[PDB]
A = this chain, B = another copy of it.
Amino acid sequence: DEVRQIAPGQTGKIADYNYKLPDDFTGCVIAWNSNNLDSKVGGNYNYLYRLFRKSNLKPFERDISTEIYQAGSTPCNGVEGFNCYFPLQSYGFQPTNG
């Protein structure tokens, strides 16, 4: 459901937070299904993604910051408290998906 957002000039939660496509994008995108190898029974959670991110991500840049994002202004000192959440999230891959 996120291959739609990978295009020059589109918004979302992945195209703006993991890889920003500039307007002058002359590259090619190749995608295919290989669900028989990268997904197993029991819940495949080795792949992580960044759904929470502060502002944006510059084109052709990589962000690997694991700092807990702050929503309000109360600091959490890196715990699972209130008004903060850990930015990386796990996928929901399953070999019996649609």
Contacts and interface: CB of A to CB of B under 8 A. Distances in A.
Interface in A8-31: 11-13, 16-17
Contacts of A16: 82
Q: With a 10 A CB-CB cut-off, give which of A52, A69, A83 has the most chain B CB atoms.
A: A83
A81 interface: yes
A12 B51 contact: no
A6 interface: no
A7 interface: no
Interface string A32-63: 00000000000101000001110000000000
Interface of A: 11-13, 16-17, 43, 45, 51-53, 69, 71-75, 79-83, 85-86, 88-92
